[PDB]
Amino acid sequence: THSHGLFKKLGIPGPTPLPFLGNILSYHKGFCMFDMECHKKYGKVWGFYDGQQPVLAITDPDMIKTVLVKECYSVFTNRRPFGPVGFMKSAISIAEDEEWKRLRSLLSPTFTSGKLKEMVPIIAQYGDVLVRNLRREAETGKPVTLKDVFGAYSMDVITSTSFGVNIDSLNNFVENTKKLLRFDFLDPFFLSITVFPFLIPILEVLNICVFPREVTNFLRKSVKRMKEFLQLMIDSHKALSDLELVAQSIIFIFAGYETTSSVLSFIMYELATHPDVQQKLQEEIDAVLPNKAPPTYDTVLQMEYLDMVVNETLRLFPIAMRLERVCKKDVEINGMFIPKGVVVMIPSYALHRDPKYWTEPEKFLPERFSKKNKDNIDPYIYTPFGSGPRNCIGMRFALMNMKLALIRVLQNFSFKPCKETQIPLKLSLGGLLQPEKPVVLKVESRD
Amino acid sequence: THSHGLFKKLGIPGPTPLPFLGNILSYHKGFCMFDMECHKKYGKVWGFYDGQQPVLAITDPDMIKTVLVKECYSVFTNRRPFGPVGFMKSAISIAEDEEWKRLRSLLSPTFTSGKLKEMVPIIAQYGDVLVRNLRREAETGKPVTLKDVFGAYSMDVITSTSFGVNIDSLNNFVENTKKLLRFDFLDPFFLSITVFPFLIPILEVLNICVFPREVTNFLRKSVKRMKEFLQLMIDSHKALSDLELVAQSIIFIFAGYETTSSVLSFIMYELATHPDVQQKLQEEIDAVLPNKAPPTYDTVLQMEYLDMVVNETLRLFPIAMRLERVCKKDVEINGMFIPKGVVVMIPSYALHRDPKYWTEPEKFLPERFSKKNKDNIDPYIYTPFGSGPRNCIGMRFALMNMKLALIRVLQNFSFKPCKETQIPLKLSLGGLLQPEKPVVLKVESRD
Ligand code: HEM
Ligand code: HEM
């Protein structure tokens, strides 16, 4: 337990680590609370230890720009290798160095504006399915669990756009990609792996992994039954393998399900707790789409206030919480020596709520992102989708998918806080950015 | 246990591996016997599995040249990472990629002809100490264990040339660098690590290592007591650390002790079992050094037949047995696809005894390396010191040290087979190239 002396010899402050555990006991208050308190106590830069792994947090916009953009291909190319992943090591978000660069090139044409434009009529059909299912619980007279309806919509969207299967999940493959697509408190296992990272090779050789070794076997034979986004990988650097075909699919499914449904639930909580914003957004939607006109590609991009609501919600709730890069070699960025093997981390949650760049950070104020004030927002302090060559590849898809769902939802319904609604919203202290109690709101039809 | 299908899908022949073990059970006959039988059975190229690690053996001189010389910096830069090494990971023979390239640059000036020329008067003193200790067992009238006297000479030489300490080991620091410098059958532990390579991180975090955690602490404080080759590392890419200072020293000690003493014992066995070669060599020594003149730098290089004896012995007994390189990326060398992660291996022992390049390989014939026939010897079939940028850095030092010992020894003594001498010499079946029974020979003074 002697890596614990690296930050003191470097002159970098931080919390004093305990033997074996490091600083992981400070995660009791939550990973995000630990980042904000370290930022207030140590200032610009600090370091801590996840067990024996040294992590260096940076808050300077120029230094964040160097890590994520300038020295990406050379120094900060890969993310932190985490617990037993098995064949998921071939996934793009997991691949490293040249194997990632190949997959990034093979999958970048999937998310072009031309491909995204052809997905609008497909995912607009499920927006109508979402509105239909939203009424049978709106006419029910009792509050709605938003994560359930948004979860079924996110799965219906990602299943048809990635492959081509069209299922109504809320009324029902789905049983293997919904229940078998949930995260039943892997927090204790993630903590033990962090404390015992040397046990990872043992779990790998035993073929033990975070995912169940069936869901993949289901998707493995499902993709094999589909032969006669999934098109681009088959039509074809280096040709993609069949097992690597499934790896990228699973990443897109988890990305399309959890991220899209979680942020949509955070948005509706802010619209219900701020009705004047909800009305102003419905007025912009009604003015751009008169008489409940169906949303289109060019239409969604015209709604300026809709973009401000999504941006402000992504400020308060950056579902990735952190950006991380592994230091491949000894470097000196912006006047600071970074030794090899240190996980450089950018605390997005803490930076999005820093009282240095934001007026009243705890307030939900869409006016920060208006055409006037948006110029004063540093793109390396507000990083909801990351930045640089390894940023979110599905940023435009996620923005388009969420906005299409928000428009169709707000065209027909209004959302008010129910008696069961937790106000203020408290965040879970686990490894995922999600509310403590599930978001429930009263839904009322507008017509 | 499914890496076992890589060579069959590549079209590469080889022995069928067992689950978990791979082909390690074929090591019962010895690592070198396994290489020769695979070469006779599969021809040019074959593959096997050390547990789950795929190893690809190559015998083509053009392909060996590409692996060791052409694509060293790009593809085949590092050797196979083996069991728990601890702080010895900073050693030059263990370092990888840019950390090795730095150490190779910092330690190459140590072995220049200018430095080697200044070491001759130092190591010639121990040649006289070796002759003195060789008489008290020659006048004893009973055979001599060559590994003991050559072991003390090799340690006395490497201790003074690396640092500056001058000790008579055979008559006595030495207790910590002799007994604590021996290999007490680590073969079962090496086998279990090969079968359980996933247990290596467990031994590392427990600070368990192949070396005793005292010998290093002795050398760590001994080097610290020496402050007031060791000069070049202190006088100073990047400056060398104090803990990395000890790592390179331990590698030089094990290299100077085992390799020098083992080959010298193999040479004297061939000179005793071939007296006409021993006489012819003594005649060349007497003609170049009249009246037992002390050997010098330029003198040793003039003895052509002495170079032929050392070369031929290094053919039959290449103490490294194999050269290995880890494939850093997917490549296609000389018309063959090499997947990433495969350990490319060059079987030096089998190639040195191949009936395709050598007439009567089992025969000790120094005439193969005469000025006439040496031109027909492919430098990539006869690779006693390796080749390319990562060849033996102490080649000229080892050649000079052994020849200086051979000259002073043959100037005074003659060596004959004793009743206890094992004829023919059989090799141990462990991981080291050493005789089955220790080499004992009758020593007689010439004056
Ligand atoms: C609100 C929705 C989303 C948010 C806020 C989000 C955010 C992020 C962030 C912060 C990163 C890390 C960037 C970095 O480290 O610099 C990332 C990476 C990534 N995201 Fe997203 N994401 C969202 C939705 C999606 C969707 C829908 C997909 C795919 C269908 C997706 C695919 C990916 C991939 C593949 C990566 C890794 C890229 C690489 O390693 O090269 N994301 N995302
Ligand atoms: C008869 C004596 C010796 C023989 C036959 C021998 C042979 C070899 C061989 C075959 C290699 C591997 C080359 C390759 O993989 O291409 C090697 C590497 C090496 N040898 Fe020797 N060696 C001897 C003595 C020594 C001595 C006396 C020293 C130092 C004092 C030494 C230092 C090294 C080092 C440092 C390496 C690794 C170089 C690197 O990784 O860059 N060797 N030797």
UniProtKB/Swiss-Prot annotation, chains A, B:
Phenotype for L243P: In allele CYP3A4*18; exhibits higher turnover numbers for testosterone and chlorpyrifos
Result when mutating R136Q: In allele CYP3A4*15
Bilayer topology term: Single-pass membrane protein
Residue positions binding heme: C392
Highest rank taxon of the organism: Eukaryota
Tissue specificity of this protein: Expressed in prostate and liver. According to some authors, it is not expressed in brain. According to others, weak levels of expression are measured in some brain locations. Also expressed in epithelium of the small intestine and large intestine, bile duct, nasal mucosa, kidney, adrenal cortex, epithelium of the gastric mucosa with intestinal metaplasia, gallbladder, intercalated ducts of the pancreas, chief cells of the parathyroid and the corpus luteum of the ovary (at protein level).
Effect of G30D: In allele CYP3A4*7
Cofactor(s) this protein cannot do without: heme
Effect of P417S: In allele CYP3A4*19
Outcome of mutating D148H: In allele CYP3A4*10
Other comment: Chimeric transcripts, characterized by CYP3A43 exon 1 joined at canonical splice sites to distinct sets of CYP3A4 exons, have been detected. All are possibly produced by trans-splicing. The chimeric transcripts exist in 3 different combinations: CYP3A43 exon 1 joined in frame to CYP3A4 exons 2-13, CYP3A43 exon 1 joined in frame to CYP3A4 exons 4-13 and CYP3A43 exon 1 joined in frame to CYP3A4 exon 7-13. The longest chimeric isoform (CYP3A43 exon 1 joined to CYP3A4 exons 2-13) exhibits 6-beta-hydroxylase activity, while a shorter isoform (CYP3A43 exon 1 joined to CYP3A4 exons 4-13) does not.
Record: disease: Vitamin D-dependent rickets 3: An autosomal dominant disorder of vitamin D metabolism resulting in early-onset rickets, reduced serum levels of the vitamin D metabolites 25-hydroxyvitamin D and 1,25-dihydroxyvitamin D, and deficient responsiveness to parent and activated forms of vitamin D.
Free-text function comment from the UniProt entry: A cytochrome P450 monooxygenase involved in the metabolism of sterols, steroid hormones, retinoids and fatty acids. Mechanistically, uses molecular oxygen inserting one oxygen atom into a substrate, and reducing the second into a water molecule, with two electrons provided by NADPH via cytochrome P450 reductase (NADPH--hemoprotein reductase). Catalyzes the hydroxylation of carbon-hydrogen bonds.
Record protein name field: Cytochrome P450 3A4
Upper taxonomic lineage: Eukaryota, Metazoa, Chordata, Craniata, Vertebrata
